[PDB]
Design a binder for this molecule. Structure first.
Ligand code: AKG
Ligand code: AKG
Ligand code: K
Lengths: 197, 206
């Protein structure tokens, strides 16, 4: 029952210790952390072939679109659940987005306004997975924090917005900067507070 | 019509093409500028640097018997490998290799740490005549737990990952921006940590 040590900080959903996240089928690398709100750059999230397969599944179906469930998407969602420390049933599913040149995603929040039907089971965290390499542009940027993550195939950026202090959630404003050369493919997993699917 | 101080590192885009390798720009903290970089050193280059740091090429002892000091670690005298790596690093850092102090190798064992500090020298010192302006810390091995490079005034950490590096600079006119680059190496709690550091001076050093 010792004295208080350091300042009191809100607990996060992502609570992994160390430099690696050992999932059932892959060891994910913790690359960098912005402490609060928690933004984590992750390495070795998806294999090259998994990235290819997700893009292919996306093209055959066609803003973006969710993939239909199959053995690959369930495998990937299971791995993602280990990273995000929330059961896969809380995720909305693998949503695939393709940016052509000059396309972008203007800054926004991923959680829903309190006064909306969707906020009854609100989003609490996001994982953005880079499915290809982007010749130029396409950074994921957080303008209130002056932090950017640059696309790199197989890597991902994790961030959460489940804080009691709503100003911390409001620091998670983020966008996809315009692609200026090449194209950008991402998969996004948005995680809800409760079971979604 | 007008629409921030300029930086030494001014690379545009997602990669840095050097004479022999394409380095990956992974993440950027804008000001003071801190950049996580991928694909800096190959696995074998990391292993060889570690081995060289235990040879007669080293000028001192690379390992220590809890707080790392400025006498801890060793500079490597020049050979074919170190020159090749310094040439690559110079393209990353946008400064000629002759401004670098040379590869400095440091080994941390369990419980060892580098308490938070600045890399630049105090104005009132002989070393400030040709002060340091930027640092590249290259991770030469994997660390299971601990060993993060942390910036306590910015609440940002970079975790060790073999072959990656963190770059940061402290050549700003606004001195408060330089003082935001206070950083350290968090204690290694499982395994060991090997790094190479290149410190770059404003003018020719060697
Ligand atoms: O394209 C990006 O980098 C950002 C993606 C994003 O904002 C999302 O998928 O929710
Ligand atoms: O060990 C680290 O992560 C940081 C080392 C450092 O601060 C330096 O090499 O100058
Ligand atoms: K030293």
């Amino acid at each position: 029952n010792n004295n208080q040590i350091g300042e009191n900080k809100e607990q996060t959903i992502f609570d992994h210790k160390g430099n690696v996240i050992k999932t059932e089928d892959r060891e994910i690398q913790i690359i960098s952390k912005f402490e609060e709100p928690l933004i984590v750059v992750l390495g070795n999230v998806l294999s090259d072939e998994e990235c290819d397969e997700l893009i292919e599944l996306s093209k055959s179906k066609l803003s973006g679109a969710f993939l239909d469930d199959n053995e690959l998407t369930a495998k990937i969602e299971k791995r993602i659940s280990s990273i995000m420390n929330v059961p896969a049933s809380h995720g909305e599913g693998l949503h695939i987005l393709n940016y052509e040149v000059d396309q972008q995603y203007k800054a926004h929040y991923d959680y829903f306004a309190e006064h909306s039907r969707s906020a009854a089971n609100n989003r609490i965290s996001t994982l953005v997975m880079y499915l290809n390499d982007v010749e130029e542009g396409g950074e994921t940027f957080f303008p209130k924090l002056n932090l950017s993550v640059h696309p790199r195939k197989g890597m991902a950026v994790y961030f959460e917005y489940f804080y009691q202090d709503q100003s911390l959630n409001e620091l998670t404003l983020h966008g996809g900067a315009p692609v200026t050369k090449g194209e950008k493919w991402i998969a996004t997993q948005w995680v809800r507070r409760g079971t979604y699917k």
